[PDB]
Amino acid sequence: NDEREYLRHFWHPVCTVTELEKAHPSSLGPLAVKLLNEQLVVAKLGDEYVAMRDRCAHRSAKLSLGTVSGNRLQCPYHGWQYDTHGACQLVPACPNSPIPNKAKVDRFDCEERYGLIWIRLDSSFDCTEIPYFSAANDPRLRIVIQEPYWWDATAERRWENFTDFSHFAFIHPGTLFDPNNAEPPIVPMDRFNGQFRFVYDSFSYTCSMPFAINLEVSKYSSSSLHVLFNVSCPVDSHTTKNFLIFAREQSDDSDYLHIAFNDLVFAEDKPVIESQWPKDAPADEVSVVADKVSIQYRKWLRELKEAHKEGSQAFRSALLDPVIESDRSY
Amino acid sequence: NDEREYLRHFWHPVCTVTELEKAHPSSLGPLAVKLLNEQLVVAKLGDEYVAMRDRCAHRSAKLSLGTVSGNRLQCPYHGWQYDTHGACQLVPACPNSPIPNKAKVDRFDCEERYGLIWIRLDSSFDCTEIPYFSAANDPRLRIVIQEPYWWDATAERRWENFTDFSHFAFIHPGTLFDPNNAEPPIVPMDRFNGQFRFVYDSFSYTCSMPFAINLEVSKYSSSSLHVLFNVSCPVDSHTTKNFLIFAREQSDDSDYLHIAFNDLVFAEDKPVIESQWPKDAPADEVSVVADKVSIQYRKWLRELKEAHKEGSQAFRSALLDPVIESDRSY
Amino acid sequence: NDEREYLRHFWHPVCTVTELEKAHPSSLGPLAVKLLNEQLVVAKLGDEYVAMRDRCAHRSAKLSLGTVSGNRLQCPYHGWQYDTHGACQLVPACPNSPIPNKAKVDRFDCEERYGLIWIRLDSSFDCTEIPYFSAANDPRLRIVIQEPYWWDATAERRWENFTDFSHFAFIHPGTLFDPNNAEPPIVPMDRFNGQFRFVYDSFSYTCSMPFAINLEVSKYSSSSLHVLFNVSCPVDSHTTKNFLIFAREQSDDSDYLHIAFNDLVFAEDKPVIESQWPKDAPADEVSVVADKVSIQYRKWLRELKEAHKEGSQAFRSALLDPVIESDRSY
Amino acid sequence: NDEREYLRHFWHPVCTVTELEKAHPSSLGPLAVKLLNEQLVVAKLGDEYVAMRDRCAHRSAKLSLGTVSGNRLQCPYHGWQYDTHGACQLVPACPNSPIPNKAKVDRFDCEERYGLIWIRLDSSFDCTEIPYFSAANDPRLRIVIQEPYWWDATAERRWENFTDFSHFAFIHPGTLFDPNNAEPPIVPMDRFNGQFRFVYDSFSYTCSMPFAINLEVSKYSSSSLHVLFNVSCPVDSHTTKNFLIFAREQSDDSDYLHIAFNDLVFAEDKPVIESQWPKDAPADEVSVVADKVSIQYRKWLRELKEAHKEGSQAFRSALLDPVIESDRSY
Amino acid sequence: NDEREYLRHFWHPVCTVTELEKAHPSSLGPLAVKLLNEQLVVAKLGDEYVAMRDRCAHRSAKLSLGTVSGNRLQCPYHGWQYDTHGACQLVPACPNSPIPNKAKVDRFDCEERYGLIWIRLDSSFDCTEIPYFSAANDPRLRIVIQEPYWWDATAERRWENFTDFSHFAFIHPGTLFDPNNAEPPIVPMDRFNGQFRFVYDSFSYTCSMPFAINLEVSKYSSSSLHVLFNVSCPVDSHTTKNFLIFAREQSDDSDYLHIAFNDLVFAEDKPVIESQWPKDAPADEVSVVADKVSIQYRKWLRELKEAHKEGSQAFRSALLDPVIESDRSY
Amino acid sequence: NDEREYLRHFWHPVCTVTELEKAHPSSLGPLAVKLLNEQLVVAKLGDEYVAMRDRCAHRSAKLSLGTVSGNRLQCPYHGWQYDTHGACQLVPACPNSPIPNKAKVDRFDCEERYGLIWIRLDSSFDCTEIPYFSAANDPRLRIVIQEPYWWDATAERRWENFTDFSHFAFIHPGTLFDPNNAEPPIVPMDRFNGQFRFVYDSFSYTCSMPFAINLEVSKYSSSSLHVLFNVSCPVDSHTTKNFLIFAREQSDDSDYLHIAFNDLVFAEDKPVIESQWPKDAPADEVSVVADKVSIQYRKWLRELKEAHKEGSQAFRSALLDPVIESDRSY
Ligand code: FES
Ligand code: FES
Ligand code: FES
Ligand code: FES
Ligand code: FES
Ligand code: FES
Ligand SMILES: [Fe+3]
């Protein structure tokens, strides 16, 4: 249902690498996944992470109950095998007949990065990249990948909560609220290279549109820096599979000191954000000046929506044209 | 859809008072309630039981997850606070900024009586009143408020089961059937003051429309009184939250003796009334002579539903115009 | 919804006889059954098994919560009695007044055979008959009736699964796959007397349309016959209630030896056939040559569907007209 | 613990035959049974039903997790095979070396009768036999074997419950109590051939000691006989596994008509008999005159207990010596 | 097991009055209860709360599954009736025989007070009274009786927690810890009339030995007073059924404002107190000067233990001899 | 009782390091653990993994419910704090009073190695060391620490299952059985340095007594290594917490490929080893030639158990004295 069609051009994370390896005893998958209400299967065929529609072209069985055979995905029902382009190469019942030309299942751009598996459902605008994680490569940093966490909220609403400042005092009094710096500021926001960028005082955001946040917290550079990377998988209209990867300089402490803390603040948000109805933000919400980030976010998604209808070039401009508001130089 | 629109003009019970006090440790509420598919929140602000739509005007969190602070209801997300008129009176993020005029939520007529909280969603026709309970104030009687009991059944069908005389022999054979009173009488039924009134020998029904039933019983076992006040709340298309208050003259025995008995009668009804399908009674049900109470009630509802269409006064007339069939005065 | 209407003309099994006896302590029933999204009640009235809409004419209660009384079915709410023709013959509340002419509930052809209760919702074409079980009569044979097994898949897909050959190697490797007889044959299929007939080499299939299969196996081991009779009740758009009656001539062994093995092959099919989506076979399924039985079955159903809209005798032609493709005498 | 040792000399039922067949997909078993706090395994070896300690000689694994292999039982751990005499005849790890003389597990008299598997743990007295079911042979009769029902009560208390008369009015008011035959008779009891015999007026009891009851009912309605055969497996100190086989000559009705009614009377007994504490009847129980059957049963058990410590032929006397109290010919 | 024998002379609460009325639809009971490992049944026979051993003298069935008939308790098995002295008065099976003299079940002192039902298992020292609740009678005070709450701890350990001062800072930081008055004092303790008495600054304890606490909190008499009455039922060696009744002057607020708060502080204690092992305080616990109350408590229980062995007069002295430590005059 | 007393002199693993870090959000612990029926608490105080009895010296709360504060473990009840020696260093209630000398809890030898935490309950014989893991430090190998897996089985029987050669054909037929290596060899077994050593062709076992097993495998499938280190922890009379660490040379594949495989092997063992009864192997088990490893191990344990009785040095000798059967050097 096509108010969300523009979302198909972006790269979305569907599972962790370790979720795929855990899925089937072979460690190759297949793993079933759902993205923007599409039912897909992921599997490692050879050296490629391949993503096809989880529906076989023959009698419509789910390839995710199949098995990986060599470099192919084998349907569990009558054993057809599919190659990295989703084409059937073996029909065991008539191995000497021709393979019908329609014996084919849709395939989607599937690439690994940062420890997660990303899928891009519609490549026809050739102008979106996998979101940016600042801490990959940086060898001073230890990187932990938390289990995915699922919310009954939309990627847009989850996004907005992660970049929200006004809510600390009420949802996170014990864990995030700084009573001396109690009231949030207004900050300039830049569009650059498909990302939103803004800073605090020091927290620095690089939000690859639509659903990814890259938050670099430094302790006025004195101590040492901490990076949060949080991206929402729009599973369906009501649901998100949410991924948090975090990196830290100070690696001497326990990973589960941080994992529990993150876990805690997410548990504080979840019941509120899930309560918001209607699940998608209607046009009768009343804002005030602290909501700059949420408004600017919605402004740009609307433009990306309209730009999409106009077509490829319009969308490329909408996404990548810079819109600088601050003094920082690019 | 809006075939139930007329029902919004009546007072409906949403919860017992204890339910609201129990809902949150402050004993002030808030408590969430569903009335005719509407999501509402109920709270004690100062001296008032207040009812609002359970949806914040900022970013649409459920206020039922919030907390009562002072004489206002404070949202869980960013702590906007709403007064007894549903107007925001504090935006914690910009305390030195003026509150938007649209920063308000719908408020509803909300009044406590008999130990229950009543809400009127539409007050425009200004002509409905909270059902009549005969045993309030009468200091000779001991009143008990059972816990709400829920049925997968509509308020109309719950009402028809309660005033039905024909089911005693079959659903309640060992608890309410009188062997040599096995065939039900046809009875005069008057409309007075927006109530149905009729008796049976005694059993004296005073049913404030649409969903309340007040049954006084001058026992053939006592020469002393016993009173059943039952009111169905239509929470949605398929289910009711049902309330039972009963008073008794012979107040010397255990409350639970009668509570257990009522609970058993309802247990005998419940499966059968839930089995009735469609949930709303269609035109092809075939009534008989002994269904006089069923018929008059469907007739009055149908008239009231029509009157609602033709506007305020035609409704006030269909409710309040008297119609006498028996030989009593009023 | 008129897409499945032609199926109402066939006899469908809804329950075993032992199901009807177990369903109520009388052993006469009533038992609630669902067929083609119709809610029905079955009860034993005298010497007849009769079937009615499980919805009482009076106030729409479910007669399946009622009791059998002599030779009628008694609604649990107000006690109306319905005879074998679905006619109300007693109304307790006015046992003298005349019973209305609308005091009837629809009655459906219902007759027991093979230990199953079969229902024909539409009899206006008068050309359909209960499926053919080869092994009734045959006193050389022991007949076990397995308990109904439910799947989340449609009767057609269930059917195509039962008659499939290509799948043995992949979902039944250790239970049905013969490595010698590893690749599937294409074999003549006859239409005779409304049944599909075809044979293997020694497996003889007789398939009373649409959802019944009678398979005779003259195993390559001795002179010891085996018959499997499998038939799918289409209870709604997504689910089947399936029955299996099996007969064997080597009958000195335990029934549970064959029940376990039967159950195991069904356990292997189930997750896969259930996985198939959409539940109903769409036009974009790619067949190969080995799918002959599938494609001929689907083609015959289509003729039966479109014969139905023509009228009575067009259907009877499409169903019963012989169409023989092999050299066998009928 | 030597308080219950005399019971090891009787045949006790441990499972139905259909239990043994259902317990493993071969239908040969093995099935684990518990009797008099002994853990046993039952399996079908060729034409014999054999019973062994469910504890393998080698490393003490449970043979009930094993498989039947030809005419032996195969331990699941290291594959030792035991024959009908409980002797190991194969040791895979050294199939040439001599099998030790201790490579044996205890074997117990085990023979099928009436559709049940019966076990005699001690055969050294050679004077006990499987209880007497009156209705085997009788081709006028249909014999139903109900599924075993478990109670948390001892076999004696189960027994005294079955033969009780005073309780009908209070736990079976609506199912067995006759208000005409309201008060219980005292009736002669004979000991003959190791059974208690007594009759009512038309109920004839034959009770093969200790825990079996054969009750024949020539009802006051016509010439239609009914037999109930009930027997308690003492599985430990606190619990019974009880069996009921029932036969009827009026056999045109459903089995489930009698199974439900049977089950209902047992449902009524169960909570009460289970409530009795201590589970074993202490000396301070106060009888009245109507407890004749109870007191004679308990007295006979005591003689059987103390005859046991004397030795073989003292027991056989106490058990089999006739002791007739009525005027009937044996 | 007889380290706890002295406890049988005290009055113990076993249930609330409303627990007895809820237990059976008659509102008369019977209700089963367990005290110091004794299995008892409570029932209202006439105007008396009667308590007997929950074991019938005939065949050992539990009278708690019976019913109250007139002024008697009727066993559920064979219908014997027991009067307020535990004597059988009716044997329905031989209504014209003599009633055996042993047809009797033990009866125990059973009296209601404060809304609870108290049982005294051993009256032979005639020198213990039901604990003292300061707020009964006082008409300025509203009295609420919370549902009983069960802990896996002993009455002695639960007692000591309720009178503990040192633990606020750690188990109740959010709810009871007063940071300005952070460290506990040492207070003089008096023995008077079987009660311990001590005060704070103002909290005033009157602990009727062994297991009852009566805590009067006044707000330096300025505002208004609040009374907590908490008593532990020593169910068995590991378990307590705990009763809290509380009274307040200020009755204008919700009962469930206090009930939730109490509930909260109990939830804070429960997992700690349950963790203490061994469950009974062994002789190797190390005390410090803040533990005066716990030591003095243990000193007196030991003396009551020894006094009991010496006999009645010794015990009466131990319990009632005054031992004044403060200046207050008696 | 103290037949397992000798086991207290060995180092035993109680938890993985992550288990301790995960146990409480601080990542410092505490974590409760049971070792040989002893209740202990483990925490990271400063630089040390500390193990104490999980029982406060004040009033016996479990310190595992407490929190780590500074370099001490703080009790949940009154907040006594214990240093790395189990001595209380702070009594919050009387900070200006001296701490009692008996205010201390038993402390135990506690050391981290290989990612597990080891405890030695008795250090008096000072002659045991933490088991040997061959693949620590070897930088060519990738080490994985599985989650602890629990078995209702003793450490002795778990060990015997792991070194057993005779069960492959039966418990693991499709996962570890080699068809033409179906009969197990008898092998030389040496005692060195308190370890059993033996090989099989290769498979090289190094089993530090009593419960550790270090198995190196130079594959016949690779010419590269794979290492299994398995150690059972006896938590009580009937159960074990089992640890598996494995290293591999070919580190290029998914950890989960092997994790899933190990988990499947254990799944095949588990039911069978749990079925073994009695839990501790009695003298009447009949061993055969192929049980050489079983026999030598029971022999060495029995000797060690005896040596413990005769004192420190006789034990140190029975553990450490070498005994060579093969032709290798050491
Ligand atoms: S469905 Fe995939 S092979 Fe038939
Ligand atoms: S959503 Fe309610 S205050 Fe922001
Ligand atoms: S609804 Fe069936 S009898 Fe009235
Ligand atoms: S334990 Fe039974 S074969 Fe070894
Ligand atoms: S047990 Fe109480 S009457 Fe028989
Ligand atoms: S019990 Fe641990 S500090 Fe008191
Ligand atoms: Fe947040």
Ligand SMILES: [Fe+3]
């Ligand atoms: Fe009713």
Ligand SMILES: [Fe+3]
């Ligand atoms: Fe199949």
Ligand SMILES: [Fe+3]
């Ligand atoms: Fe009975």
Ligand SMILES: [Fe+3]
């Ligand atoms: Fe406390």
Ligand SMILES: [Fe+3]
């Ligand atoms: Fe193994």
